[PDB]
Amino acid sequence: KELVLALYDYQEKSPREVTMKKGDILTLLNSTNKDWWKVEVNGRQGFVPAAYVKKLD
């Protein structure tokens, strides 16, 4: 889907989550949830907080 810019670093804290670093360009897999968005970063998909990423449309 779209691409999102990681605005902060975020280390996963749950098994469905994924870790990212600030500046990371991630692929937006699912944005139906207002709080968690499923993204793809270096081979891993999973959720991160929606407020920590930004859409590049």
Token reading at 54: 């930004």
Resolution (A): 2.0
In 3D, which of 52, 48, 51, 50 has the Cα closest to residue 18?
A: 48
In 3D, which of 32, 37, 30 has the Cα closest to residue 51?
A: 37
Residue type, 25: I
- Solved using: X-ray
Into which CATH architecture does domain 1-57 fall? Roll (2.30)
For the chain, the structural domain boundaries read: 1-57
Q: Is 9 helix (H, G, I), strand (E, B) or coil?
A: coil
CB-CB neighbours of 39 under 10 Å: 27
How far apart are alpha carbons 32 and 43 in whole angstroms? 22
Residue type, 46: G
Integer-rounded Cα radius of gyration of the chain: 10
**What DSSP state is assigned to residue 23?**
T
